[PDB]
């Protein structure tokens, strides 16, 4: 089914009643006064602004923000250097090296995310089989140099410890949708 947006030529006859209405529309700028009215109504509406940085825009528990490396409740790293986050990363943003640890564990000696290649797609979060790499809820981490946005393993583990209290609750609020 289709409809006409700008068809109306079912021509009627110009009555003296109607001609005087067209003229008042043209001479008295009536439709232009209606537009002035609409912006006047908006003047007395409450503005939609929020008082940043004291007020924040809403976010959901799925929000894809800054990265972080998580641990187990015992303090052991979850990452086992499987390299699946590396194989999926659309941007080739993750670099990993691994070797047997001193106790024989499978662990990474290197883990980098070049946060200037990252597209924040969250695919690494999906690929990880042990919830080691996540995108936390932080979004306010702009720097003053490019080099500060190349995260090595220490930086990412530090973000994990910094944000764990909040990361753990977001996974708790969302893992059942995954």
């Amino acid at each position: 089914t289709y409809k006409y947006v700008n068809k109306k030529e079912q021509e009627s006859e110009v009555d003296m009643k109607s001609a005087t209405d067209n003229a008042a529309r043209i001479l008295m700028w009536t439709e232009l006064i209606r537009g002035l009215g609409m912006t006047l109504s908006y003047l007395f509406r409450e503005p939609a602004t929020i008082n940043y940085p004291f007020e924040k825009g809403p976010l959901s528990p799925r929000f894809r923000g800054e990265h972080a490396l998580r641990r187990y409740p015992s303090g052991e790293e979850r990452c086992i250097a499987c390299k699946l986050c590396e194989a999926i990363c659309p941007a080739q943003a993750i670099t990993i090296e691994a070797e047997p640890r001193a106790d024989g564990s499978r662990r990474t000696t290197r883990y980098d995310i070049d946060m200037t290649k990252c597209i924040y797609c969250g695919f690494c979060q999906e690929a990880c089989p042990v919830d080691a790499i996540v995108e936390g809820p932080n979004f306010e981490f702009s720097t003053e140099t490019h080099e500060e946005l190349l995260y090595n393993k220490e930086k990412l583990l530090n973000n994990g410890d910094k944000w764990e209290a909040e990361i753990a609750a977001n996974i708790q609020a969302d893992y059942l949708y995954r």
Binding site: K17, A19, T20, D21, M28
Partner: protein, 44 residues
């Protein structure tokens, strides 16, 4: 029991979508009649 995000029983109430710009204002004669009155009294 499955708990999935779904619409409530019966569905949601109707949603307006058609154009709804009201028809409002004085007639053509009333506008001109007031204006011509204002001139005549001003000229006097």
């Amino acid at each position: 029991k499955v708990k999935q995000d779904m619409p409530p029983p019966g569905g949601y109430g109707p949603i307006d979508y058609k154009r709804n710009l009201p028809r409002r204002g004085l007639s053509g004669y009333s506008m001109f009649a007031v204006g011509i009155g204002a001139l005549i009294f001003g000229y006097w």
